[PDB]
Amino acid sequence: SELLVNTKSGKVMGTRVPVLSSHISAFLGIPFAEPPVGNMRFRRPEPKKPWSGVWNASTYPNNCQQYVDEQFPGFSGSEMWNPNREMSEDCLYLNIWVPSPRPKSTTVMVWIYGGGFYSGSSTLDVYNGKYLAYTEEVVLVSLSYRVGAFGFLALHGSQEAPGNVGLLDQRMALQWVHDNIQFFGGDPKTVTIFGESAGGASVGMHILSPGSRDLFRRAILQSGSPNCPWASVSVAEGRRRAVELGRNLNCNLNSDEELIHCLREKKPQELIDVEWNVLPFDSIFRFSFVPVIDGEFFPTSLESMLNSGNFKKTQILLGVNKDEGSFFLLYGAPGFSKDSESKISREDFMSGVKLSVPHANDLGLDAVTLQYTDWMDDNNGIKNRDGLDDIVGDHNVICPLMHFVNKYTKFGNGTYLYFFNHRASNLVWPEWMGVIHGYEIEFVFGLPLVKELNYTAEEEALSRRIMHYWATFAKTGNPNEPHSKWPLFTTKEQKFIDLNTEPMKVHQRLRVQMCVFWNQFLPKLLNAT
Ligand SMILES: CC1=C[C@H]2Cc3[nH]c(=O)ccc3[C@]3(C1)NCCC[C@H]23
Numbered sequence: 034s035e036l037l038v039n040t041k042s043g044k045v046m047g048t049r050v051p052v053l054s055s056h057i058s059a060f061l062g063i064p065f066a067e068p069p070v071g072n073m074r075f076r077r078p079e080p081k082k083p084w085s086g087v088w089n090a091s092t093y094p095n096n097c098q099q100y101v102d103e104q105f106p107g108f109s110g111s112e113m114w115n116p117n118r119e120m121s122e123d124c125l126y127l128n129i130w131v132p133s134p135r136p137k138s139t140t141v142m143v144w145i146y147g148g149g150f151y152s153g154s155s156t157l158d159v160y161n162g163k164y165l166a167y168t169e170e171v172v173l174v175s176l177s178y179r180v181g182a183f184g185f186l187a188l189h190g191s192q193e194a195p196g197n198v199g200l201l202d203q204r205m206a207l208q209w210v211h212d213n214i215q216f217f218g219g220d221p222k223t224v225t226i227f228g229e230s231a232g233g234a235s236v237g238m239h240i241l242s243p244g245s246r247d248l249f250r251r252a253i254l255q256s257g258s259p260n261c262p263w264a265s266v267s268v269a270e271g272r273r274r275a276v277e278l279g280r281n282l283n284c285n286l287n288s289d290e291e292l293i294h295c296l297r298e299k300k301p302q303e304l305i306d307v308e309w310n311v312l313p314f315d316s317i318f319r320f321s322f323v324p325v326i327d328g329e330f331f332p333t334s335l336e337s338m339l340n341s342g343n344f345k346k347t348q349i350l351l352g353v354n355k356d357e358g359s360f361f362l363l364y365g366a367p368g369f370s371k372d373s374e375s376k377i378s379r380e381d382f383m384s385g386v387k388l389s390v391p392h393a394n395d396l397g398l399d400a401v402t403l404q405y406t407d408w409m410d411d412n413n414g415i416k417n418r419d420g421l422d423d424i425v426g427d428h429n430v431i432c433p434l435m436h437f438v439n440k441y442t443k444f445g446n447g448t449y450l451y452f453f454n455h456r457a458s459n460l461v462w463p464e465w466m467g468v469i470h471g472y473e474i475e476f477v478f479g480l481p482l483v484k485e486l487n488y489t490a491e492e493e494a495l496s497r498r499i500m501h502y503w504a505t506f507a508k509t510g511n512p513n514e515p516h517s518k519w520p521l522f523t524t525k526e527q528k529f530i531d532l533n534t535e536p537m538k539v540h541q542r543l544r545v546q547m548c549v550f551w552n553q554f555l556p557k558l559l560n561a562t
């Protein structure tokens with residue numbers, strides 16, 4: 034039977050699922066590690082003990098314990114990202130969608146969710162791999178990993194809460210896939226990891242980390258880069274945040290062992306309740322528990338690794354959306370609201386600048402402000418709103434990604450860059466938010482192919498184009514159909530393409546004007562001052 038698979042960890046039984054008037058197999062909730070509960074909380078994941086009998090892989094697993102967004106109760110726009118299954122620390126499972134009939138050795142894609150390392154679920158409707166698996170005939174895997182303090186509390190030096198364990202969870206799932214995907218018809222030597230936002234930064238981190246490199250072949254990064262300003266902290270800052278968390282739960286802070294023991298005696302929600310209290314500055318696009326530059330998972334600083342070519346050399350496909358910053362300004366910056374056009378005053382603009390570059394001194398805040406203000410029309414509310422949107426997106430996603438792509442391309446074996454700028458016709462978020470962070474995902478996963486979802490014919494065609502670009506690249510290292518063009522991104526030309534419903538257009542030097550400011554000038558200014 035097609036729904037029965039014997040793996041090295043034991044036998045699993047899947048389920049048939051309908052998709053676009055057809056069907057494929059799905060093995061949901063396959064465990065890849067021992068439950069990270071009790072004394073195991075904060076510890077590195079342990080490989081799953083093989084089992085006898087048949088594991089029921091017919092239903093989605095629990096979602097990891099995480100902060101739940103209740104900023105707009107009942108609103109589909111935000112609810113679609115919240116956990117849609119019971120939360121539990123016993124959450125280390127993966128999902129696999131397999132074409133029917135079962136392939137023998139086909140292209141494999143592994144998805145990594147990316148809610149800023151503090152949230153995300155492999156079970157969201159927007160992450161349903163059945164459309165992509167089916168349409169492109171690939172074996173689609175979505176993994177899970179601990180988020181928040183559970184996945185990233187870091188007390189460097191202790192073996193109890195070393196930090197980066199959520200990245201280790203990802204690595205274990207990649208290892209399981211590498212070891213067992215052949216049994217589901219996938220080619221373990223042709224695995225492409227892909228992810229968005231923190232998932233995109235994660236993908237880059239596995240490209241960098243020596244211990245993760247051999248577990249996959251190619252990589253796709255969507256609106257996320259490993260060098261993003263919010264994607265990691267130093268060992269010292271990580272330690273400070275762990276101590277501060279303990280201080281918030283009235284923990285004994287006499288030793289690491291004292292602190293860790295206390296944190297393990299707290300219920301999941303108690304940790305989540307005070308998680309946002311440990312940030313060092315009032316800021317946006319900053320998350321509490323993220324990867325730590327530790328000397329193990331990351332041998333040296335990211336920049337020196339990038340500079341010396343110390344990373345997996347292969348092909349990558351990546352890009353960004355037009356208005357990456359809007360979501361974060363909506364959730365926090367003074368002046369933005371979901372139901373108004375959010376025209377911004379000069380004063381709120383400046384408050385926004387400060388929330389956006391929290392580490393900067395006044396001179397630095399002045400430099401940014403100068404750079405993004407139209408001094409002829411400095412009180413124009415629309416311009417202030419849009420400039421702030423660009424500041425957030427440029428600083429947090431685009432420029433860090435452009436720096437990564439340029440550093441990578443000097444040593445890689447092929448780069449393909451895109452700029453996604455199509456606003457979905459059925460978007461429930463206000464128009465001022467534009468092409469929002471995370472909204473290219475639904476096209477990558479092919480939801481536009483589903484009639485009831487209300488997309489236009491043009492949108493369905495865009496989704497098919499994107500899915501085929503992603504799948505062809507995963508299979509060959511080139512998104513273009515041989516003898517059927519998305520140009521290769523090179524150090525010299527630096528070409529990229531737009532992804533929308535209009536005829537493809539090739540461009541060059543994506544936001545180079547602003548990224549020279551964020552990647553070369555500002556860092557220099559903050560270091561001199
Ligand atoms: C940090 C973050 C980054 C984006 C990616 C993401 N991914 C998730 O899985 C859950 C929430 C989210 C986010 C939170 N909130 C919903 C809109 C997308 C963004």
Ligand SMILES: *[C@@H]1O[C@H](CO)[C@@H](O)[C@H](O)[C@H]1NC(C)=O
Binds near residue numbers: 089091092
């Ligand atoms: C688990 O598998 C059994 C069959 O062995 C099935 O009846 C059940 O519905 C599955 N999941 C549930 C509902 O707990």
Ligand SMILES: *[C@@H]1O[C@H](CO)[C@@H](O)[C@H](O)[C@H]1NC(C)=O
Binds near residue numbers: 445446447448
């Ligand atoms: C990738 O590597 C192969 C051989 O190692 C080489 O022939 C090819 O030119 C490289 N491609 C790129 C885009 O660098």
